[PDB]
Amino acid sequence: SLPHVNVGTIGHVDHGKTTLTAALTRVCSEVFGSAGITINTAHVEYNSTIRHYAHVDCPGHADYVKNMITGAAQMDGAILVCSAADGPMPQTREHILLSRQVGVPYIVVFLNKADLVDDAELLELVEMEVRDLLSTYDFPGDDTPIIIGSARMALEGKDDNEMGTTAVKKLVETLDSYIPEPVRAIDQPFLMPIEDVFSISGRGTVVTGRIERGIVRVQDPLEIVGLRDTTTTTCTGVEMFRKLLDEGRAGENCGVLLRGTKRDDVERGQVLVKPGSVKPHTKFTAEVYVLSKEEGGRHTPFFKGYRPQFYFRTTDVTGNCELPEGVEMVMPGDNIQMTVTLIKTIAMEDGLRFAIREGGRTVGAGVVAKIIE
Ligand SMILES: Nc1nc2c(ncn2[C@@H]2O[C@H](COP(=O)(O)OP(=O)(O)O)[C@@H](O)[C@H]2O)c(=O)[nH]1
Ligand SMILES: [Mg+2]
């Protein structure tokens, strides 16, 4: 019955990510607890005194790109592993960038392989490089907790000079205090993506869907957002399988009974929300992973002016893609940032995920990085 927090290890190949993952389970055991698109992930769990951690680790760079953009769980925090012996390397940079793009709110650093460094100046040098890297992508580099140690010593139950077990312990306690309790879906502002719309003989409207987050109750005031100008409405009932109720909750499939809505003020793909909670937008920055030929996507490389369908929750909307300055094409299996302009408005926030399709043939997965307009 402990608070659930999603974490993971990021950084360059060979810097110690998988080892630190194993050390974390061992150390938490000894000091606290117990123990289409193809994506290789390893999953692990450990408890501190106050939290249950669900921890993801991926083999290679390509896995991190796909998982962070379209992976099963969104990290509430990421542990950046950087080798103190080697200093930062290309995927040290790119994984911080990708964390920014994907909306990972916090990053903690473990400077690994301290057993290999007998040189205070080198540790200082590498720490400064990493703080700078973090600040380059708007993480608070100067205030980032950086723990120095040896994941491998910890994994082997060694703790000479507190480099091993103690350091991984300090890491977990940093997780405890630096990453806030995430807000559960049930406690966020109400949102349901609309699927079907049925007029109750002109006396009201049922809009159906699966509540994505929050709670809706009889008498609640609501807005209908996207595709056309926002309208207001009032909930007068909730239809569930077999039952008419006064309430519906995140996770539940229902029909929300509405009054004050005009037949065609409401359609599929709009979102029913707590008033003032989400706004409609058309233009945004996005990190996109373009599917592989093998993954059932495209074999063709596309160019500037590409106009695919963007799928957001329960509908799709045509959009124009602008590549970054210096790029003319994008091959299958690439991941790039691009600026997108939709033909119609749609409810959206930073961190919202979407699919890209051509004629019902999935070609990309993306996340909204930054809303423009
Ligand atoms: N000397 C030393 N080697 C380490 C440490 N942590 C990991 N390694 C070694 O680095 C190599 C790659 O580590 P691994 O955890 O698989 O790196 P990953 O690719 O980041 O997942 C392995 O041979 C590890 O034993 C450490 O603290 N000290
Ligand atoms: Mg690994």
Q: Residue 299 belongs to a domain with what CATH number?
A: 2.40.30.10
Would you tell me how many other CB atoms lie within 10 Å of the CB of residue 267?
16
Q: In angstroms, rounded to a whole number, what is the distance separating the alpha carbons of residues 142 and 130? A: 10
Both 78 and 205 in one domain: the answer is no
Task: Find out whether 182 is annotated in a ligand binding site.
Answer: no
**DSSP-assigned beta bridge partners for residue 105:** none
| Cα(227) to centroid(ligand 1), Å | 51
Give distance in angstroms: CA of 8 to centre of ligand 1.
16
Residues 297 and 267 in one domain: no
Q: Are residues 145 and 240 in the same domain?
A: no
**92: CATH:** 3.40.50.300
Q: How far is CA 112 from CA 96, 173, 352, in A?
A: 17, 17, 33
Check whether residue 232 and residue 301 sit in a common domain: no
In the numeric block, which tokens belong to residue 82? 């950087």
Q: Is 169 annotated as a binding residue?
A: no
Range(s) of the domain holding residue 166: 1-182
95 within ligand 1 shell (Cβ under 6 A):
no
Task: Tell whether 142 and 172 lie within a shared domain.
Answer: yes
C-alpha–C-alpha distance, residues 85 and 126, integer Å: 9
Tally the residues of the chain.
Answer: 373
Question: How far, in Å, from the CA of 291 to the mean position of ligand 1?
Answer: 31
**C-alpha closest to that of 278 among 355, 345, 356:** 345
Q: Give the Cα separation of 149 and 163 in Å (integer).
A: 5
The residue among 151, 182, 213 that closes a domain is: 182
What is the structure's resolution, reported in angstroms to one decimal?
2.3
Q: Is 114 annotated as a binding residue?
A: yes
Q: Whose CA is nearest to atom 3 of ligand 1?
A: 113
Contact yes or no for 210/42 (Cβ under 8 A):
no
Residue 310 contacts residue 318 (beta carbons within 8 Å): yes
Is the four-CA dihedral 360, 365, 367, 370 of positive or negative sign? negative
Quick count: other Cβ atoms within 10 Å of Cβ 150? 30
SS (H, E, C) the chain: CCCEEEEEEECCCCCCHHHHHHHHHHHHHHHCCCCCCCCCCEEEEEECCCCEEEEEECCCHHHHHHHHHHCCCCCCCEEEEEECCCCCCHHHHHHHHHHHHHCCCCEEEEEECHHHCCCHHHHHHHHHHHHHHHHHCCCCCCCCCEEECCHHHHHCCCCHHHCCHHHHHHHHHHHHHHCCCCCCHHHCCCEEECCCEEECCCCCEEEEEECCECEEECCCEEEEEECEEEEEEEEEEEEECCEEECEEECCCEEEEEEECCCHHHCCECEEEECCCCCCEEEEEEEEEEECCCCCCCCCCCEECCCCCEEEECCEEEEEEEECCCCCCEECCCCEEEEEEEEEEEEECCCCCEEEEEECCEEEEEEEEEEECC
Q: Are 371 and 284 in contact (CB under 8 A)?
A: yes
Residue whose pair of structure tokens reads 């029909």 in the numeric block? 255
Same domain membership, residue 344 and residue 266: no
Q: How far apart are CA 313 and CA 319, in angstroms?
A: 15
Distance CA 239, CA 257 (A): 7
Do 285 and 263 share a domain, yes or no? no
Contact 283, 338 (CB under 8 A): no
Total domains in the fold of the chain: 3
Taking CA atoms only, the protein residue closest to ligand 1 atom 5 is 152
- How far apart CA 208 and CA 35 sit, in angstroms, is 43
Q: Are residues 163 and 221 in the same domain?
A: no
Ligand 1, pocket-test mutation among 9, 14, 95, most atoms within 8 A of CB: 14
Output 274-277 pairs: Cβ under 8 A, ≥24 positions apart: 274/189, 274/190, 274/191, 274/214, 274/220, 274/222, 274/223, 275/221, 275/222, 275/223, 275/232, 276/223, 277/189, 277/190, 277/191, 277/223
The rounded Å distance from CA 150 to ligand 1 centre is 9
Cβ(298) to ligand 1 under 6 A?
no
Question: Residue 17 CA: which ligand is closest?
Answer: 1
Torsion angle, alpha carbons of 225, 230, 231, 237, to 10 = 10
Does any ligand 1 atom lie closer than 6 A to the CB of residue 112?
yes
Those residues with Cβ within 8 angstroms of residue 124's Cβ, 6 or more apart along the chain or in another chain = none
> Are 171 and 39 in a shared domain?
yes
Phi first, then psi, for residue 86 (nearest 5°) are: -110, -25
Task: Look at ligand 1, atom 25, and give the residue with the nearest C-alpha.
Answer: 152
CB distance 68 to 9 below 8 Å? no
Tell me: is residue 304 an annotated ligand-binding position.
Answer: no
Way it was determined: X-ray
Q: Are residues 23 and 150 in the same domain?
A: yes
Q: CA angle, 226 as apex, 221 and 230 as ends, to 5°? A: 45
β partners of residue 5: 53
Of 207, 212, 177, 172, which Cα lies nearest the Cα of 192?
Answer: 212
The torsion of the CA quartet 126, 131, 132, 138, rounded to 10 degrees, works out to 150
State which of 182, 202, 230 marks the end of a domain. 182
Count of other CB atoms within 10 angstroms of residue 44: 17
**Catalytic residue numbers?**
14, 17-18, 61
* Cβ count within 10 A of residue 151: 29
Q: Is the dihedral of CA 161, 166, 170, 172 positive or negative?
A: positive
Measure 16 CA to ligand 1 centroid, in angstroms: 4
* Domain endpoint, select from 263, 279, 295: 279
Q: Which atom of ligand 1 is nearest to the CA of 112?
A: 27
Residues 149, 17: one domain? yes
From the CA of 167, the nearest ligand is 1
Cα 148 from chain centroid (whole Å): 27
Same domain, 200 and 167: no
**Whose C-alpha lies nearest to ligand 1, atom 13?**
16
**Encoded tokens for 371:** 């809303």
CB 324 within 8 A of CB 336: yes
Q: Determine the Cα angle at 218 with ends 215 and 223, to 5°.
A: 70
Judge contact between 70 and 37, C-beta under 8 A.
Answer: yes
Q: Is 13 annotated as a binding residue?
A: yes
CA distance 98 to 306: 23
How far is Cα 42 from Cα 36, in angstroms, rounded to an integer? 19
